[PDB]
Amino acid sequence: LYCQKGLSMTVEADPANMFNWTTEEVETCDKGALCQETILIIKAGTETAILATKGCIPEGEEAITIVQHSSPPGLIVTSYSNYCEDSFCNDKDSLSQFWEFSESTTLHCPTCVALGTCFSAPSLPCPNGTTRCYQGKLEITGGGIESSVEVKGCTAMIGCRLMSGILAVGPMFVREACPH
């Protein structure tokens, strides 16, 4: 078994539906391994953090798993994970299917997303249906991803639940914590 191999952690001012999940490299799996491609997409205002991993994983169930962790209005978090058992099967290139990333009471909320800590988080007018401000940090380990992501923005979600308690995202483990 051979798998597309690549690792990418970026914050884009450009939409997710122009991200190219290109991988040049391939790698050889131990026997009984799977191919995985896993991506976590976090949009705050006009910026999108994209944490993406492709390679062999020694064990797992063949499955495609799409999770809409947070839906509009406001902060949007989607993950896609494909665990597949044919050589080169982890070949996804486009995120165009995730149109959540293509777009009375007004909330103004500090807005940012950053690898590490946000340089700045200006308070911006929130999309209609927002009821509160979110501030959190995601500590991510697994699949060769090691990062903290700071996230502030607009939401109608209750509590510290940007990930909706779905903390396993293919081989990544995402620990979500908020200020108080």
Ligand X SMILES: *[C@@H]1O[C@H](CO)[C@@H](O)[C@H](O)[C@H]1NC(C)=O
Structure tokens at 39: 């991506």
DSSP one-letter code for 13: S
By beta-carbon proximity to Pt ion, the closer residue of 94 and 141 is 94
Strands 63-70 vs 132-142: parallel, antiparallel or unpaired: unpaired
114 close to 149: Cβ distance less than 8 angstroms: yes
- What does 128 bind: Pt ion, ligand X, none (CB cut-off 5 to 8 Å by kind)? ligand X
128 binds ligand X (CB under 6 A): yes
Which residues are CB-contacts of 84 (< 8 A; sequence separation ≥ 6)?
34, 35, 36, 62, 90
CB closest to Pt ion, residue no: 153
108 binds ligand X (CB under 6 A): no
- Which listed residue (26, 56, 115, 166) binds Pt ion by CB under 5 A? 56
74 binds Pt ion (CB under 5 A): yes
Q: How many residues touch ligand X (CB under 6 A)?
A: 2
- What does 104 bind: Pt ion, ligand X, none (CB cut-off 5 to 8 Å by kind)? ligand X
127 close to 93: Cβ distance less than 8 angstroms: no
Give the footprint of ligand X on this chain (CB under 6 A). 104, 128
